[PDB]
Amino acid sequence: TTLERIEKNFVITDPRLPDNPIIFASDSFLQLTEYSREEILGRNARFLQGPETDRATVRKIRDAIDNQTEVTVQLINYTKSGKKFWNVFHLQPMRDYKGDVQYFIGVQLDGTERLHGAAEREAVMLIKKTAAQIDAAAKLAAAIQQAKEVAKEVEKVAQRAEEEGNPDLRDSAKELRRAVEEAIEIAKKIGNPELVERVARLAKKAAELIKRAIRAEKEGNRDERREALERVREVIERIEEDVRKAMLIAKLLEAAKKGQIEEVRRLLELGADANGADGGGTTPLHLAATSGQLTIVEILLRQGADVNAADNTGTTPLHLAAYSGHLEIVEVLLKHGADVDASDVFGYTPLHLAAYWGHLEIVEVLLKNGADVNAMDSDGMTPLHLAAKWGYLEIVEVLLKHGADVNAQDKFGKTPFDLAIDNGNEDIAEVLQKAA
Ligand SMILES: Cc1cc2nc3c(=O)[nH]c(=O)nc-3n(C[C@H](O)[C@H](O)[C@H](O)COP(=O)(O)O)c2cc1C
Ligand SMILES: [Cl-]
Ligand SMILES: [Cl-]
Ligand SMILES: [Mg+2]
Numbered sequence: 419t420t421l422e423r424i425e426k427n428f429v430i431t432d433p434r435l436p437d438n439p440i441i442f443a444s445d446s447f448l449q450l451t452e453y454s455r456e457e458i459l460g461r462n463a464r465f466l467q468g469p470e471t472d473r474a475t476v477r478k479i480r481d482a483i484d485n486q487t488e489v490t491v492q493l494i495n496y497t498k499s500g501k502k503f504w505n506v507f508h509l510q511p512m513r514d515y516k517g518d519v520q521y522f523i524g525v526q527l528d529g530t531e532r533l534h535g536a537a538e539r540e541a542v543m544l545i546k547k548t549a550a551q552i553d554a555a556a557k558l559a560a561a562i563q564q565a566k567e568v569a570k571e572v573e574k575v576a577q578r579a580e581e582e583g584n585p586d587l588r589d590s591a592k593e594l595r596r597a598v599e600e601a602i603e604i605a606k607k608i609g610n611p612e613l614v615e616r617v618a619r620l621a622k623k624a625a626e627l628i629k630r631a632i633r634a635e636k637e638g639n640r641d642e643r644r645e646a647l648e649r650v651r652e653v654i655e656r657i658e659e660d661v662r663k664a665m666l667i668a669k670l671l672e673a674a675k676k677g678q679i680e681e682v683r684r685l686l687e688l689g690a691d692a693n694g695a696d697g698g699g700t701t702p703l704h705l706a707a708t709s710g711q712l713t714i715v716e717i718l719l720r721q722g723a724d725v726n727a728a729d730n731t732g733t734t735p736l737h738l739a740a741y742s743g744h745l746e747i748v749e750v751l752l753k754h755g756a757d758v759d760a761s762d763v764f765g766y767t768p769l770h771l772a773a774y775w776g777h778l779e780i781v782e783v784l785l786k787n788g789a790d791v792n793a794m795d796s797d798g799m800t801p802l803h804l805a806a807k808w809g810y811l812e813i814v815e816v817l818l819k820h821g822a823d824v825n826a827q828d829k830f831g832k833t834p835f836d837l838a839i840d841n842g843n844e845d846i847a848e849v850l851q852k853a854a
Contacts (some may be wrong), residue, residue, distance in 0.1 A: 420606075421556065424444060424548065424555060427446045427526040427527070429724065430523055431460045431521060445613060447526065459708070464744065470494040475492070479492050480769075483509065485637070486511050490530050490545070492504060506526070508549050508588060509524050512553055525546075526545075527541045558614065559615035565585075565602055568622045571597045571622070572621060572625050579628065591628055594625070597654060600661045600665075601657070608664060610666050617657055618656050621658060666688060666690035667690060669685050670691075671705060674702035674703075674709075674714055686718075699728065702714075707738045707744070707824055708739070709742075719754045731764075733762050735756065736770055737766070738786065740780055741775050743775060774808065776808065781813050785820040794826070800823065801817055801822065802817045802822040802824070805834070806838040806850065807838070807841055809841070814850070825854070833850075
């Protein structure tokens with residue numbers, strides 16, 4: 419299936435069955451855990467736990483499942499041979515359009531230790547992006563199934579029109595079956611199961627109206643046949659417009675990632691949506707920003723791209739430019755109204771990223787554009803914490819000049835000074851001590 423395409427550790431469970439068993443285990447999961455598929459299907463995932471597993475952590479999982487909400491935790495699990503591993507584990511419910519839970523998705527990122535700060539952030543976003551793709555792949559597989567069913571009915575409507583000597587109605591049906599196939603292929607490209615579902619339902623309508631045209635024809639009703647056919651033509655036109663809009667978006671994302679300036683321009687001139695996004699919320703501006711495509715950045719902003727577009731993990735183009743160390747892109751996004759304080763789902767601002775990645779001139783520019791020097795992530799860490807932990811003496815100095823709080827304490831009651839001492843960064847400890 420599409421889920422057999424995803425090469426990550428995950429399982430899907432069925433909460434409608436007694437004790438919420440695993441109904442799907444990716445081969446990565448089987449490879450991680452040293453169990454066979456036969457050993458795993460029909461089992462509750464708690465068999466991964468063992469002596470060292472933190473029972474309060476497991477109670478967090480229990481409460482999140484019982485409240486039908488998502489949760490992310492880190493907890494010790496065990497292979498079949500009894501090998502300990504750390505598991506960054508993300509849970510989220512897979513719901514119907516009615517908003518009613520049907521499965522649970524569970525993604526495991528295996529490691530040797532408990533992660534904190536920036537490594538914790540990286541793991542959390544990875545597994546959150548895996549879960550979202552598993553959701554989309556499942557919603558796509560279901561939408562595509564229904565659409566191939568409509569496509570088969572359109573083919574029988576084509577055969578019926580031909581049998582009845584209506585090649586115009588037969589030709590409309592054939593066009594309609596091609597448009598649905600087109601929709602399926604573009605929707606996989608951009609991760610948009612809503613496009614498939616919308617196009618399948620419109621194709622179904624055009625099929626019903628062709629059949630209404632055939633019945634009008636057998637009764638000799640000229641006016642009814644012509645009106646049914648005109649409506650069929652405008653439904654096919656509407657389907658072709660939908661597919662074209664989705665195809666321009668797929669092409670504009672691809673042009674931005676490739677760095678094709680003239681192609682970006684051409685596609686925007688044809689009416690490509692500057693704010694079109696893949697299933698994960700990535701925009702052309704995200705791809706240009708992260709790859710240092712300054713001209714493409716300026717073109718997109720001029721053509722109405724949202725400088726502050728957030729993907730599914732709250733990541734903005736300013737974040738991507740800041741970690742990537744694209745100083746001129748950072749300058750241009752800020753010049754065009756980028757929110758200097760945008761926080762992702764982990765609480766990281768662009769300044770957190772600049773500080774962790776050791777981009778001193780980017781830290782300077784963010785600060786000079788009004789960045790909150792004391793912004794705290796979900797672990798209570800400020801940029802000064804990150805600069806002190808990672809040995810960035812000059813960034814430490816710049817943060818202090820721009821008002822960084824020497825006394826700010828993270829989740830663990832640690833100040834930047836404490837992290838400097840804990841990490842051997844005695845020169846930094848001295849600057850922080852003098853500043854206090
Ligand atoms: C989709 C999904 C995946 C899960 N994956 C894991 C896992 O990788 N590791 C783990 O220790 N528990 C995992 N669990 C949690 C357990 O199955 C169970 O919910 C947890 O132990 C708390 O409930 P309990 O107190 O009844 O055991 C997962 C649960 C679900 C719904
Ligand atoms: Cl860190
Ligand atoms: Cl009609
Ligand atoms: Mg359970």
